[PDB]
Write a protein that binds this ligand. Structure first.
Ligand SMILES: NC(=O)c1ncn([C@@H]2O[C@H](COP(=O)(O)O)[C@@H](O)[C@H]2O)c1/N=C/N[C@@H]1O[C@H](COP(=O)(O)O)[C@@H](O)[C@H]1O
Length: 246
């Protein structure tokens, strides 16, 4: 499924080049109508990142997120700055379908295993956003991608598989926000290694052909952010492409 994404800094829709907070482009302070148009084009799930919160969990945009989730009638997943079990509970209570977590899942595995026990694996998406080095190590980034964690994608997948891990969002950070194309080889590999996980591809989609290029990877979701903000194609066109390649 196509998963349109919005990223938010202090109420403003933005695109960050490779997630670099010093490299923003602005797309207005009206995310709700934007999402509603996505949903009207047929979007089945929507993705929101609270970039203000990912950088400083003290400054999460909790009121805005609540308004956006309540303002559409399709499932919304939300990430950025979640740190506690109470954070997760509050998002789910406000109608969020799935809570997307990266930092704390790397930093405090015993704690997050407890979250899996309380909320169930259907309610949690593990974000494993990676900088892939020259040797091929898929190093997971945390703290709004500002920190390189020293831990691989695969180590973290194996950490949570025994407590029922089912949803993983995997961004190739080098592609994020660049329109350069998504990392097809990355998803081919990880999807095959972990057929029991529903992977969401993320970062780099630049045109309809880039979506089509993912058809054989086995990913269950295709996140698209920048290309939709720039109008490279419509959500309806993206959905048509994915329906068809499947
Ligand atoms: N610096 C960052 O940009 C960043 N930092 C954290 N995140 C997300 O925050 C959440 C993790 O937050 P913590 O739990 O670590 O606080 C996860 O959702 C991470 O992906 C970040 N993700 C931002 N944007 C994503 O980048 C991709 C861009 O796609 P494109 O436009 O089509 O090219 C899409 O998946 C966008 O949603």
């Amino acid at each position: 499924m196509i998963i349109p994404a919005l990223n938010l800094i202090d109420g403003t829709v933005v695109r960050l080049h490779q997630g670099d907070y010093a490299r923003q482009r602005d797309y207005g302070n009206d995310p709700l109508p934007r999402l509603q148009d996505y949903a009207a084009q047929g979007a089945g799930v929507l993705h929101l990142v609270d970039l203000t919160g990912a950088k400083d969990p003290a400054k999460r945009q909790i009121p805005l997120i609540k308004t956006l989730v309540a303002g559409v009638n399709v499932p919304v997943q939300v990430g950025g700055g979640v740190r506690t079990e109470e954070d997760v509970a509050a998002l789910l209570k406000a109608g969020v379908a799935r809570v997307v977590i990266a930092s704390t899942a790397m930093k405090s595995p015993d704690v997050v295993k407890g979250w899996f026990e309380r909320f169930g694996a259907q309610a949690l998406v593990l974000a494993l956003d990676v900088r892939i080095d020259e040797h091929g190590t898929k190093q997971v980034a945390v703290s709004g991608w500002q920190e390189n964690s020293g831990v691989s994608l695969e180590q973290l997948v194996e950490t949570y598989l025994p407590v029922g891990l089912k949803h993983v969002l995997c961004t190739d950070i080098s592609r994020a926000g660049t329109l350069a194309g998504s990392n097809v080889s990355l998803y081919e590999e990880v999807c095959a290694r972990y057929p029991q996980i529903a992977f969401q591809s993320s970062g780099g989609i630049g045109d309809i052909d880039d979506i089509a290029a993912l058809r054989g990877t086995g990913v269950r979701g295709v996140i698209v952010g920048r290309a939709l903000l720039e109008g490279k194609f419509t959500v309806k066109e993206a959905i048509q492409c994915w329906q068809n390649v499947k």
